[PDB]
Amino acid sequence: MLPWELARFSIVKDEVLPHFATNEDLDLANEIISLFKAGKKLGEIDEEIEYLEKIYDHKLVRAFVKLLTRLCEFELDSPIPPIQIRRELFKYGPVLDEKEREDIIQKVSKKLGADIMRFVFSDLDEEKKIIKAPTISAEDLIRWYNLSLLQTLLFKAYKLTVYVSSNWKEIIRRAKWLGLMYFAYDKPLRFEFLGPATLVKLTEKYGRNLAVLLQFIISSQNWKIEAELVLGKKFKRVYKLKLANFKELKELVIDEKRFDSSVEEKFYKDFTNVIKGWKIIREPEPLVVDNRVFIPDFLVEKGNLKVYVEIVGFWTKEYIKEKLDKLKKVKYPILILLNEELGKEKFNGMNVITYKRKIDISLVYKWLRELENKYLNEVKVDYTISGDIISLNEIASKLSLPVEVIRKNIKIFPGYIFLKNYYVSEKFLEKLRNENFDNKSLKELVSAYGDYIVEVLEFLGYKLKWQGISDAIVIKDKK
Amino acid sequence: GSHMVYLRYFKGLILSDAYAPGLKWSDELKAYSALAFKYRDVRKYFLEKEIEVEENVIDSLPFPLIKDKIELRDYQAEAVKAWLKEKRGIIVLPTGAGKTQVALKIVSIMKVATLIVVPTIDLITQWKERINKYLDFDPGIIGGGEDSLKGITVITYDSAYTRAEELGNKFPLLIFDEVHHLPSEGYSIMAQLFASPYRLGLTATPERDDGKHELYPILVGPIVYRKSVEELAGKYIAKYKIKKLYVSLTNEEKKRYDGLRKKLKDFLSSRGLKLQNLDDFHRLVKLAAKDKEAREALLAWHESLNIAVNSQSKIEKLREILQEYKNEKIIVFTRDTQMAYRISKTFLIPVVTYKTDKDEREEILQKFRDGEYRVIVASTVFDEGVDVPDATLAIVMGGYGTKRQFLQRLGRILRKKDKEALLIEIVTKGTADYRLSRRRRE
Ligand SMILES: [Cl-]
Ligand SMILES: [Cl-]
Ligand SMILES: [Cl-]
């Protein structure tokens, strides 16, 4: 909310060095604070500070004035719309003598029933009047500047990396509350929030959100952040804004700590009742693929199947696209819920369910039930305790089912290893290695053990003959 | 059949199946073609050679219903009839002689859609008003934040150039107020992009130091009637009367005025007192960075000139003049904006600042033009407010100084009216009069 035309900073190499206020700027801070005393027009504050606009930096002077004004309390608006006061009052044209002037004031003051003179220009900021003087110290004015300036540069940020180690849990769901757009990584454990440069229409409200999350990060024992600012019209170029555990930063905005969301808490609830086939976990453990954390909102489970769900705050075409492609290495289905905002026709996706104001558990099911109707390929759970060995045909024989349906649905059991066309308990196989038959032929010795050649083949087997029975040159050997 | 040649307009150009003097084939355009302005002479060519055309060039806007409320003077009526023989060329008169009336009478005669192109925004206001009074029609505007396209339209030279292809074939008549700007390298192309056959030029200074005014015959036409100021020197207001009154400070003001002034006389002289030199002024500024008493020194100097510029006597002098001239509408100019509110609150007259809602400003201006309000205050400091309404008298109070550019605009904005104008300027006889009156600047 501080104007760009008032942002003052410097550039060396690839870093944007902000011209923060120091204690060299206290005489300045004092003289301006001294001027905001009760019963004074701030329009005439602008005339007073002209001489200070010359002796110091005009960007620093005005920026203080705007900040102090914001914390003053003024006479509230007139009971009559000031446009109509002037329309009715100025009807008598030029009136010269004070007694006729005194007549006309009384005349319309009765016609409208209020003190015309005190309110005639109440709507114009020039003709305001300070009732409660600001209570800011000349020193807290300087820290509050250095945060207003800090939040101003960030408002033109490509992205914003927040390096965090201990406060990992809190700042995330607060950002999720605030509805930001971001990618998380695990090499330094950073969060690369998308800066308000990405948004276009509601950027002023997005940047205010990011501005809120910043404030929670500065009020900590140790913190580090890096923002990317894109500067230049004819010759654009990215610069760095690095700042870590900085001192001069005090906020005079109260966020009111609403500490809950209207759509988020309505999501965890609306699903618990209207979709009972699934048993949802509140906050899945953070998945990490390719040194990057992909925090999902919640995971839902229809028995064996488990899918991740994430409801997003702010949307943009490139963000969802980049995310699902990044989550294309998640090895599990996902569903993403997006608030109805500027971005249109963004719900035309496999995971895109675009809500409007709150969570509609109804619309989730039509996809949630579609993903299991689409998984209509018969997979029947089966157990096998090997007598000596388990046969796939045997597993088919017991079940009174054709062999094929088992062959398609082959399952892996922690007990055994699957040599083709059979199973073998890993204890039975580990001992059969100690048997240690070097080479054989004619398949006569296979009958004594009575299993498949598949078991023999895995350890040390080779054959140069396709035929098995009454088949010449059958022989297996180690070499 | 094969006895019809095509002649069409296309994005500022003229296109044709058959050759004509001025055209040149384009493989890119697949026709003989040139810029749109050659439309008039090519049409007459084809017509003279008795060649049948399928003409599609001018897609006119409808010429509206008007009432000609204009009764010209002798030389003015000679001006219209001079242009009418060829319907192309530059009329030349000095300021106030009625260049607008000459044009708007031609408008009433031609009865074709007309675009009127003007250099500045102050001129859009003048032209808009005069088309309402003299033709009883509110014209469309392209410029000044306004985008309306009507049978009669006022437009800037810049918007004209920006939109030339869009509007090239829409107005048969084309007026260029202040035409000497037209030969400039940029507007040269702007002129050529319109197909308009009938084109009028108006100027008091037809001649151009660049020598580029030799482009007139190919862009608008030659000068068709000229009279110098001496050549007629009558039947129009020949100047605006300036009166520069000085008023003395208040008893209570003069006291604090000198005391602060004497506190500087002692301190500034104590260490390096050099004045009226700009380099010395920054010397005090650089010193005041660290010295607490040096900043106070510069504070008092500002406080002294402030007590001068905003002298409550200057307001008291306004009551005298407003009382003593009540024949017609008066417009008070003040550089300062908070000081303008004083004038409003005291005399119960409407104020206009740069931060005034366009809705409000419309009321305060349209009621002024109508004649519900008699006297109005204005403060054109930051957002330069063009001298929107014409009147009989204007008071300027800018004590520290008036931009002669700004000062001269008030003259020309008043000069065009048919009645003599009076311009008062109230300077306080204190620091303002002592420092501003040193250099005459005439
Ligand atoms: Cl050809
Ligand atoms: Cl020449
Ligand atoms: Cl000087």
Kind and range of the H or E element at A11? strand A9-12
Q: Which of A96, A104, A108 to mutate to test the interface with B (most CBs of B within 10 A)?
A: A96
**What is the CB neighbour count within 10 angstroms for residue A44?**
13
Beta carbons of B411 and B242 less than 8 angstroms apart: no
B115, B192, B350, B392, B422 from B153: Cα distances, Å: 5, 19, 30, 27, 32
A147, A375, A452 from A405: Cα distances, Å: 67, 15, 21
CB contacts of B345 in chain A (<8 Å) are 117, 120-121
CA distance A47 to B25: 66
Beta-carbon separation of A27 and B292 below 8 A = yes
* CB-closest option in B344, B353, B375 to A93: B375
Which two structure tokens, joined as six digits, stand for B23? 């055209």
Segments making up each domain of chain B, as ranges: 2-59, 60-235, 236-442
Distance B44 CA to ligand 1 centre (A): 22
**What is the CB neighbour count within 10 angstroms for residue A156?**
19
* CB-closest option in B326, B338, B375 to A47: B338
Sheet with B393-396: strands ordered across: B240-247, B421-428, B393-396, B330-333, B375-378, B351-352
Sequence-distant contacts of B288-291: CB under 8 A, at least 24 apart? B288/A55, B289/A55, B289/A56
Beta carbons of B248 and B255 less than 8 angstroms apart: no
Which two structure tokens, joined as six digits, stand for A423? 């199973």
* Nearest ligand to residue B183 Cα: 2
Residue B431, amino acid: T
- Phi and psi based region of residue B218 (left: phi greater than 0; alpha: psi -120 to 50; beta: remaining): alpha
**What is the CB neighbour count within 10 angstroms for residue A469?**
6
Query: After which residues do gaps appear in chain A, with C to N over 2.5 Å?
Result: none
B63, B79, B202, B403, B417 from B101: Cα distances, Å: 18, 10, 11, 30, 11
Which two structure tokens, joined as six digits, stand for B117? 């192109």
CB contacts of A104 in chain B (<8 Å) are 348
Q: Give the closest-approach CA distance of B145 to chain A in angstroms.
A: 23
Beta-carbon separation of A90 and B350 below 8 A = yes
CA–CA–CA angle B221, B225, B229 (5° rounding): 130
CA–CA–CA angle A171, A172, A178 (5° rounding): 90
Q: In 3D, which of B167, B158, B216 has the Cα closest to residue B187? A: B158
Beta-carbon separation of B348 and A44 below 8 A = no
For residue B288, give the chain A residue with the closest CA: A55
Torsion of CA A143, A146, A151, A153, to 10 degrees: 180
**Residue B115, beta-bridge partner list:** B153, B174
Residue with tokens 């602008």: A46
Sequence-distant contacts of B321-324: CB under 8 A, at least 24 apart? B321/B245, B321/B395, B321/B424, B322/A94, B322/A96, B322/B347, B322/B375, B323/A96
Beta carbons of B104 and B70 less than 8 angstroms apart: yes
CA distance B379 to B406: 13
CA distance A412 to A84: 84
Q: Is CATH 3.40.1350 the classification given to domain A264-373?
A: yes
CB contacts of A87 in chain B (<8 Å) are 363
Q: Give the closest-approach CA distance of B323 to chain A in angstroms.
A: 7
Beta-strand relationship, B5-10 and A190-194: unpaired
Q: Is A297 marked within a binding site?
A: yes
Beta-carbon separation of A93 and B292 below 8 A = no
Segments making up each domain of chain A, as ranges: 4-71+136-244, 76-127, 264-373, 392-476
Distance separating the N- and C-terminal Cα atoms of chain A: 79
- CATH number for the segment(s) B236-442: 3.40.50.300
- Phi and psi based region of residue A24 (left: phi greater than 0; alpha: psi -120 to 50; beta: remaining): alpha
Beta-carbon separation of A117 and B345 below 8 A = yes
**Residue A184, beta-bridge partner list:** A191
Those residues with Cβ within 8 angstroms of residue A368's Cβ, 6 or more apart along the chain or in another chain: A275, A278, A300, A302, A335
CA distance B357 to B355: 7
Residue B425, amino acid: E
Say which experimental method was used: X-ray
Determine phi and psi for B70, rounding to 5 degrees: -115, 125
Residue with tokens 């396709």: A466
Beta carbons of A353 and A364 less than 8 angstroms apart: yes
Torsion of CA A423, A425, A431, A433, to 10 degrees: 30
Residue B181, amino acid: H
Q: Give the closest-approach CA distance of A154 to chain B in angstroms.
A: 30
- Phi and psi based region of residue A257 (left: phi greater than 0; alpha: psi -120 to 50; beta: remaining): left
Beta carbons of A250 and A242 less than 8 angstroms apart: no
Determine phi and psi for A206, rounding to 5 degrees: -65, -50
CA distance A317 to A198: 10
Q: In 3D, which of B158, B128, B345, B113 has the Cα closest to residue A120? A: B345
**Residue A95, beta-bridge partner list:** none
For residue A125, give the chain B residue with the closest CA: B355
Q: Is A360 marked within a binding site?
A: no
CB contacts of B372 in chain A (<8 Å) are 91
Distance A474 CA to ligand 1 centre (A): 89
Q: Is CATH 2.60.120.560 the classification given to domain B60-235?
A: no
CB contacts of B302 in chain A (<8 Å) are 50-51
Q: In 3D, which of B184, B186, B171, B165 has the Cα closest to residue B35? A: B165
Please enumerate, by residue number, every residue of B annotated as part of a binding site for ATP: 93-100, 130
In order, the DSSP letters of B179-216 are GGGTTSHHHHHHHHH---SEEEEEES----TTSGGGGH
Q: Give the closest-approach CA distance of B356 to chain A in angstroms.
A: 9
Q: Is A24 marked within a binding site?
A: no
Beta-strand relationship, A305-312 and A130-132: unpaired
Beta carbons of A311 and A336 less than 8 angstroms apart: yes
Distance A178 CA to ligand 3 centre (A): 57
Q: In 3D, which of B329, B346, B372, B375 has the Cα closest to residue A104? A: B346
CA distance B30 to B158: 31
CB contacts of B338 in chain A (<8 Å) are 41, 43-44, 46-47, 126-127
* Nearest ligand to residue B214 Cα: 2
